[PDB]
């Protein structure tokens, strides 16, 4: 989602319908990448509550 | 074909009998075609399984 948002903001900054420098759907396989969400706490457990 | 060869081939004219003769001769071939023999549109339980 953050890669997609960065691509969309790039398109807006360059004033085009489709951004030329894209961060998503590149040729690279990046299916193991993570990020920091609010789903997991500092103990390593889920954040349902 | 028996009854037709009875009838003095030179003096033949159109007739419902002739129409029925040609229709039966025509449908025998379509009945005897092998792909037509073995074929169906709707799936069975075993083929779907």
């Amino acid at each position: 989602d953050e890669a997609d948002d960065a691509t969309k903001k790039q398109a807006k900054d360059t004033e085009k319908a489709k951004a030329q420098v894209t961060y998503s759907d590149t040729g690279i396989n990046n299916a193991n990448e993570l990020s920091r969400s609010g789903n997991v706490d500092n103990e390593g457990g889920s954040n349902q509550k | 074909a028996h009854v037709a060869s009875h009838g003095l081939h030179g003096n033949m004219t159109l007739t419902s009998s002739e129409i029925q003769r040609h229709i039966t001769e025509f449908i025998s071939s379509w009945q005897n075609h092998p792909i037509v023999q073995v074929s169906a549109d709707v799936e069975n339980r075993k083929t779907a399984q």
Partner: protein, 147 residues
């Protein structure tokens, strides 16, 4: 070409690997569920047939045969036309050219399916070498049997 990532994973759980006995047993069962029917195995061959037609770069057109035949010289004052006889008896009935792909797909299944050539294709109650239209039938059968 498929690609897989190269980095520290997150410990997926993709249970898709099984032994050979667990697969041969199911093969035996599904072959037991198919014996002698011929309405259970025809649709599989038909599906493989359409898949072969969609994947193959091969085309079919009788115009090749027509143009090849049209070059031989035949006498206008005769009662038998060899080039014009095979052109007549080389048009399939019910205009279906499927039997080629279906026979080509039946190679994968000879233990439960045996593709024979129909009794209608033969010379109709005994041939005769003195008959032209009846000799082309032998030619067609000889070319078609090995497949």
């Amino acid at each position: 070409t498929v690609t897989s990532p190269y980095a520290p994973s997150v410990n997926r759980l993709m249970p898709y690997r099984i032994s050979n006995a667990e697969r041969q047993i199911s093969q035996i069962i599904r072959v037991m569920n198919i014996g002698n029917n011929a309405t259970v195995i025809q649709p599989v061959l038909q599906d493989i047939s359409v898949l072969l037609q969609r994947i193959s770069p091969l085309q079919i057109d009788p115009t090749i045969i027509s143009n090849t035949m049209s070059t031989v010289s035949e006498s206008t004052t005769q009662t038998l036309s060899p080039a014009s006889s095979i052109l007549g008896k080389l048009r399939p009935s019910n205009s279906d050219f499927s039997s080629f792909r279906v026979a080509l797909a039946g190679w994968l299944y000879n233990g439960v399916v045996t593709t024979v050539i129909d009794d209608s294709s033969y010379p109709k109650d005994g041939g005769s070498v003195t008959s032209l239209e009846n000799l082309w039938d032998f030619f067609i059968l000889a070319l078609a049997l090995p497949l």
